[PDB]
Amino acid sequence: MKLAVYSTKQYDKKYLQQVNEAFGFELEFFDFLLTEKTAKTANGCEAVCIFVNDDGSRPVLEELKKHGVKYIALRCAGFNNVDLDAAKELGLQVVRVPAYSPEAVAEHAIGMMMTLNRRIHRAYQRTRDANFSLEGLTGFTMHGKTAGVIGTGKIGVAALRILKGFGMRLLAFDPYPSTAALDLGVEYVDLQTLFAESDVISLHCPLTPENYHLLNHAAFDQMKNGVMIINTSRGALIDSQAAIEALKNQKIGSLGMDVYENERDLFFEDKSVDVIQDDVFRRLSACHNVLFTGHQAFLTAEALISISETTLQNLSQLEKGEACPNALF
Amino acid sequence: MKLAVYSTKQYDKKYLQQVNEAFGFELEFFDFLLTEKTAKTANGCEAVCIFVNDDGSRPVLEELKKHGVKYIALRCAGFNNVDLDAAKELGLQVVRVPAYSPEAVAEHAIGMMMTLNRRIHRAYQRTRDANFSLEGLTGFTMHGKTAGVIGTGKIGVAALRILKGFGMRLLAFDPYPSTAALDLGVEYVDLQTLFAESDVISLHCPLTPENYHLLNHAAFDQMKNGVMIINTSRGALIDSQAAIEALKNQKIGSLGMDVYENERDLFFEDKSVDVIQDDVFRRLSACHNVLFTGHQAFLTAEALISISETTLQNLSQLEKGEACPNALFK
Amino acid sequence: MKLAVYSTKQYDKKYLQQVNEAFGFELEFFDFLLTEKTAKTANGCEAVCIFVNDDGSRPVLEELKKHGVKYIALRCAGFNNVDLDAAKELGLQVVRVPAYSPEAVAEHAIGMMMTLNRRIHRAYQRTRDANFSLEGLTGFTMHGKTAGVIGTGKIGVAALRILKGFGMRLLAFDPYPSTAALDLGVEYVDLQTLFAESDVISLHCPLTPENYHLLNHAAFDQMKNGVMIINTSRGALIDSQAAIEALKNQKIGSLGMDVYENERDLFFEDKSVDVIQDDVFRRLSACHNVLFTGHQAFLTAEALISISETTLQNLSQLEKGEACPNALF
Amino acid sequence: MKLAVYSTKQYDKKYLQQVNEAFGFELEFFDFLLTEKTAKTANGCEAVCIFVNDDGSRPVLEELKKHGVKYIALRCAGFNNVDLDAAKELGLQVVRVPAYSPEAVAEHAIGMMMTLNRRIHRAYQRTRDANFSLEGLTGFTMHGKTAGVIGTGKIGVAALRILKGFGMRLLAFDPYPSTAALDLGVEYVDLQTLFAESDVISLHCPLTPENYHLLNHAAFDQMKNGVMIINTSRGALIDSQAAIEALKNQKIGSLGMDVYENERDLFFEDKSVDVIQDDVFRRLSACHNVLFTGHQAFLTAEALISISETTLQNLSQLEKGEACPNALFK
């Protein structure tokens, strides 16, 4: 079975090749986006593997079918990229990443927190040139502080586990309180309490129409001066204009954000008939204790191996049968 | 009483002043080093407060006494910079802060680990300029990995609590196994075992003649390829020449080191007629997944407050003629 | 005519589109490399435009021919990536940009030199973080120093003009002395003399069998301690190992190199027992007063406009059947 | 004579020592600031050498006198930190370095220009990590563009020579004409014309009432979109609020500023109310093609040697009872 892989990054290739040892496919790696124009490159491949920015609508799918491709595989969860009606109709079998790694994500959140806290990113900038000055690097001791987690699904609980290790007082907000969280000693509270009492706040929840801009001006008003905020969840959970103001006011002490790729563009705000919006990343990073990562939360070897492992197992079946539920039918 | 503070940094001043509300000393802050030449600036203070780089040799002490100084407070644990015998003969009293907050230090070790693991230091260099490329940033999932801690005093135990939080398998080496550790599910093992099995290793122990160059060529050879090593303990725990080789060979995956001041200028071991360093810090940082911090482990507000409280409390006892448990001699 | 542009960077696109206002080509821009696999994307185009990394080997050319391509335009001087014998046989026509703007390249060399001299690159690393320390930034006054230029073709002469403006003594080495250089007041000399007396040295010459490793251990021995060396010419002009030792020795004070794409892996050092050969860039940049740029010497709007005009003109001449002096056969 | 040197940086020491080979002063170097408190450190010295940040006010001067100092040498042009009246009254003599090497300053201005033009500072941040991407680095060819110099004293003229070498067309605004400049082919013009026609502008003039905020909203409006501006002259030549707005609007393509020690606050936006700040420097540097240097324009070995010779020579003349042209009063 021959698989064409689009939007390939070096990490994608490394892990796919390693996982492929136990499936045996012939792999062809392309660094470029799958588009209507590039679909033809798949010719000769029974299948293609795509990621969040690849184009999966009918026009692309038509080209693929024309070129003999049967199976499409997302190394991925987000599908706003693909036009799913067509595939079934075109006789084209399909999939995504159902399982994902909660620990990788939680750990990333913690890592962002610690880096910000101890200003380790800044320290590195200095010490890489043998500048050992400590001015401006002072952090806070975690132990005995209060941590507020918004959302107690697997990721949120994984985070709480770590925060418990730090010896923090643990608070949480979730509409659906979890035994797993209670067993850790977490106290579930309303948002207002969480905002009021938390030294560190971390978002681990899905975006809903209800929680759009959950962290807004009113919310910031409730928080402690110098509060640390981490968002490895969707960008829309935070009103960016309000966060910017709160940073300027010094209400927010530190802010860490893992930026989703198709939110990067709409990230954001002011511009005067200027200046969309890499400028915001630059300014905040320079002027505040603000740290951005580029949707990096799942970027560990173990997490990547898991994504790969499956991707191959699915195709191997498809190359012959199963439910899948690789398959989205 | 009036206190002259030398080698003053902004953090030193902020926390000393804040703590001093409870004490009422008259504080005078100097940014420069105490030396034989600057000792005269103390004139009119009964006490001086110094840090690791300040010069406490006999000639300095002699000048201080000449100028009416009775008391010397080290706002740090180390005292090798001060000639204690001379101080005793001269009638001076010397006091110190015997330990730093264990939690602050452990948390710093963990922070170095995570920053290294996820290459967060590298990411920032990118994203500060709006470059979101992930190439080279790939880390490891901590959960289920094995952590080995060498030394289970308060700092090591504090680290172990955090590591337990990550859901790691916890191994340790210490001559005197601690119930507090055992209570965490820690398994104590010999060094050979700890070296063979640990994905991450962190040093939380005093330097002894016995453990000089504990992490040496034989130790590295034993370790897992890609191992992460953290040292917030003294530098001599590690044979640097061996570490540098291990990095080159890709035995050591990641290395984080909190570099003590009295220990930076001294890497050698060795070279010829051209030429030496801060170069090693620059090269390693550039070429490997290596992070140095400048003795930053105790640099938190809470830890600095503790240091400030102890220091003023020590001074307060000396002023009164009350025996000070933090005195370095009679 | 419709033209497919491969390996497209934003700058390529901006200037090609700007220039095309005068030509009316139909332009299709691709970000990815031209390869045997991607050559099919050119279907519908009479021409393609490529750069130094694109693959112009016979298998690729065969694909392009099958797909209706007639013309290949190199938006660069180099053509090592294109198999000219094959192209001829296949009836394809190949054109290039014969030279870059001399002023742009010369200015880049001077820019490198001044940045290094005043450690401006270092200063920015500091001041971007509001660190105004000057330690380690001391340079040298150019006025009254001696510059040596190796090669006095158009670029070398442009460089000399600038150097003259700094109030420097001008020396040069060329086997074929130039009237414009002589008219400027340049004194031609032997290499040994140029090495012995030059404060600053800049390489502006083509690579030849003769000058391979022209700057070698013996050359570095003859130089002044603290000498500044600039190479915007090909990498092989310098023996890297020697250069590395000379930096380590402190014979070479400063080194600036504009690194050619194809020559990127070749250079430099021992090196690494496999990946990565990039570490040399990292090491030298951190440990010494060394500056690398990525073949940036022609990267000005004006130079890019010239490349764009030449390319579109070359293509019109081809279509019209006129003689194209830029043709590679 | 023994000379105490305050606020010493490694470069000050190196060049002062090198020059002293021919003078034989006895030199004592202090890294710290001269203040009322540290003036006593000078006892045993007839002279002290100070720089722009050192405290020269009456109380300090009084201390110096008490401690036997007769001479104060400024290793710089500015002297606003020194209370000249008090000095004269106290019987102290003060000398300065009247001007920096014109070539060094002009060369600095050109260096900033080229670095900004080709985004070499950005490039280095990339290539230091083997990132050879060229996106965003595109510059412009200098040759055939127009350069406008504001001020045609020795520095402006030195800059013109260089700019001439680039093949640029030379414009200048100075009320007063320069033989050297005319001789160079320069065209004098009014400010409005200089503003309209210049691709690059560099300021090389002293601050006067007449040019306070010379580059103001109105001036920027006249300028070419994308224009490059360099200021190695004093800050108040530019209305910073107007400049910042002009950067935001994209009227100014690039801005290079050598920032005087005494002037960090001149440059401001702003709404960083909490709390008044170096933030402007961090922000502009990140968001625009902006480059700051810390009053670096004279930082070359030759320029420093000149400062050093002048300073030692002033001191020598003072010792002699000779007329020092560089004295600030008599």
| Spans of all domains in chain A | 1-101+299-329, 102-297
Q: Is D232 annotated as a binding residue?
A: yes
List of residues 6+ apart from C82 with CB closer than 8 A: C50, C56, C57, C72, C74, C94, C328
Which residues of B are less than 8 Å from C248 in CB distance? 274-275
Query: What's the fold here for domain A1-101+299-329?
Result: Rossmann fold (3.40.50)
The beta strand positions in chain D, using DSSP E, are: 2-5, 26-29, 47-50, 71-74, 93-95, 146-150, 169-173, 187-188, 200-203, 227-231, 252-258, 290-293
Whole-angstrom distance, CA of residue C102 vs CA of residue C95: 20
Residue C57 tokens, joined:
């080997």
- Which of A132, A133, A257 to mutate against chain B (most B CBs within 10 Å)? A132
Chain D interface includes A125 (CB < 8 A): no
The answer to whether residue C295 is catalytic is yes
Distance of CA A147 to the CA centre of its chain: 21
Asked whether this chain's domains A1-101+299-329 and A102-297 adopt the same fold, the reply is: yes
**Closest approach of chain A CAs to the CA of B219, in angstroms?**
26
Closest Cα in chain B to D29: B37
Asked if D293 and D110 touch (Cβ cutoff 8 Å), the reply is no
Q: A251: nearest CA in chain D? A: D274
Residue A25 CB coordination number (10 Å)? 17
Whole-angstrom Cα distance, residue B162 to residue B165? 5
Q: Is C238 exposed, middle or buried (0-12, 13-18, 19+ CB in 10 A)?
A: buried
CB contact under 8 Å between A123 and B296, yes or no, is yes
Look up the CATH number of domain A102-297. Answer: 3.40.50.720
User: What is the layout of strands, in order, in the sheet containing D2-5?
Assistant: D26-29, D2-5, D47-50, D71-74, D93-95
Q: How far apart are alpha carbons D61 and D282 in whole angstroms?
A: 37
Q: What are C66's two structure tokens? A: 């099958």
Which whole-number Å values give the CA distances from D214 to C272, D110, D194, D227, in the listed order?
56, 21, 13, 16
Point out residues after which chain A has a gap (C–N over 2.5 Å): none
Distance, in angstroms, between C155 CA and closest chain D CA? 13
CB D126 within 8 A of CB D178: no
Give the position of tokens 């934003």.
C10
CA–CA distance, B100 with B77 (Å, rounded to integer): 8
Query: Under a CB-based contact definition with an 8 Å cutoff, are residues B162 and A166 in contact?
Result: yes
Instruction: Give the whole-angstrom CA distance, residue D308 versus residue D327.
Output: 16
Q: Looking at the partner chain, which of C32, C125, C128 has a beta carbon nearest the beta carbon of A32?
A: C32
> Which of D121, D134, D166 lies at the smallest CB-CB distance from C9?
D134
CA distances from C65 to C46, C82, C87, C91, D275 (A): 10, 14, 9, 8, 66
The one catalytic residue in D96, D204, D234, D309 is: D234
Encoded tokens for C259: 């690194």
Which of D252, D259, D263, D205 has the alpha carbon at shortest distance from D229?
D252
Structural class in CATH, domain D1-101+299-330: alpha beta
Q: Mutation target for D interface from B6, B34, B126: give the one with most D CBs within 10 A.
A: B126
With an 8 Å Cβ cutoff, is C285 touching chain B? Answer: yes
Q: Which of A62, A103, A263, A269 is catalytic?
A: A263
CB count in 10 Å sphere of residue D98: 12
Active site residue C89: no
Q: How many C-beta atoms lie closer than 10 Å to residue B189's C-beta?
A: 16
Interface contact C40-A37, CB threshold 8 A: no
CB interface of D with B, residues 11-30, below 8 Å? 30
A contacts of D130 (beta carbons < 8 Å): none
Instruction: Please indicate whether, in this complex, the C-beta atoms of B32 and D37 are within 8 angstroms of each other.
Output: no
> D136: nearest CA in chain B?
B129
Suggest the residue from B10, B287, B289 to mutate for an interface test with chain C (most C CBs closer than 10 A): B287
Q: Method of determination? A: X-ray
Which residue in A124, A121, A204 sits closest to A163, CA to CA? A204
Q: Do A140 and B300 touch (CB under 8 A)?
A: yes
Q: What are residue A292's DSSP bridge partners?
A: A257
Residues of B in contact with D129 (CB under 8 A): 125, 286
**Chain B contact set for C249 (CB, 8 A):** 274-275
Q: Where are the alpha helices (DSSP H) in B166-250?
A: 179-182, 191-197, 217-222, 240-248
Q: Identify whether the C-beta of residue D237 lies closer than 8 Å to the C-beta of residue D214.
A: yes
Phi, psi of A117 (to 5 degrees): -60, -55
Hey, how many other C-beta atoms are within 10 angstroms of the C-beta on A270? Answer: 12
Task: Copy the structure tokens of residue A93.
Answer: 């079998």
Contact C141, D302 (CB under 8 A): yes
- Strands (DSSP E) found in A247-327: 252-258, 290-293
- How far is Cα C169 from Cα C163, in angstroms, rounded to an integer? 8
| Residue stretches of the annotated binding site of C | 154-155, 174, 211, 232, 258, 295
**Structure tokens given for B104:** 């602050």
Containing D112, the helix (H) or strand (E) segment is helix D102-118
Respond yes or no: is residue A295 known to be catalytic: yes
CB interface of A with B, residues 135-154, below 8 Å = 135, 137-143
Do B141 and A104 make contact, defined as CB atoms within 8 angstroms?
yes
CA distance D202 to D180: 18
Contacts of D300 in chain C (CB under 8 A): 118, 138-141
Question: Nearest to residue B238, comparing CAs of B256, B265, B261, B262?
Answer: B256
Q: Could you tell me if C161 lies within 8 Å of chain D, comparing CB atoms?
A: yes
Q: How far is residue D217's CA from residue A228's CA, in Å, rounded to a whole number?
A: 40
Contact criterion met (CB below 8 Å) for B87 and B199 = no
What are the CA-CA distances from residue D106 to residues A236, C117, D294 (Å)? 50, 14, 15
| Those residues with Cβ within 8 angstroms of residue A53's Cβ, 6 or more apart along the chain or in another chain | A7, A33, A81, A261, A262
Tell me the nearest-neighbour CA distance from C282 into chain A, angstroms: 11
Reading phi first (left if > 0) and then psi (alpha if -120 to 50, else beta), residue D202 is in beta
Distance CA B278, CA B264 (A): 8
Interface size between A and B, measured as CB pairs under 8 A:
200
**Which chain C residues are within 8 Å of A125, Cβ to Cβ?**
129
Chain B environment of D31 (Cβ under 8 Å): 32-33
Cβ atoms of A164 and A172 closer than 8 Å:
no
Tokens 């110098």, located at residue: A226
Q: For chain B, say whether D32 makes contact (Cβ under 8 Å).
A: yes
Q: Which of D89, D263, D302, D322 is catalytic?
A: D263
Backbone angles phi, psi at A159, to 5 degrees: -65, -45
Those residues whose C-beta lies under 8 Å from the C-beta of residue A290, and which sit 6 or more positions away, are: A247, A254, A255, A256, A257, A284
Q: Which of residues 102-121 of D touch C (CB under 8 A)?
A: 103-104, 107-108, 110-112, 114-115, 117-118, 120-121
CA distance readout (Å), B144 to A87, B163, B256: 40, 11, 21
- Interatomic CA distance for residues D270 and D267, integer angstroms: 10
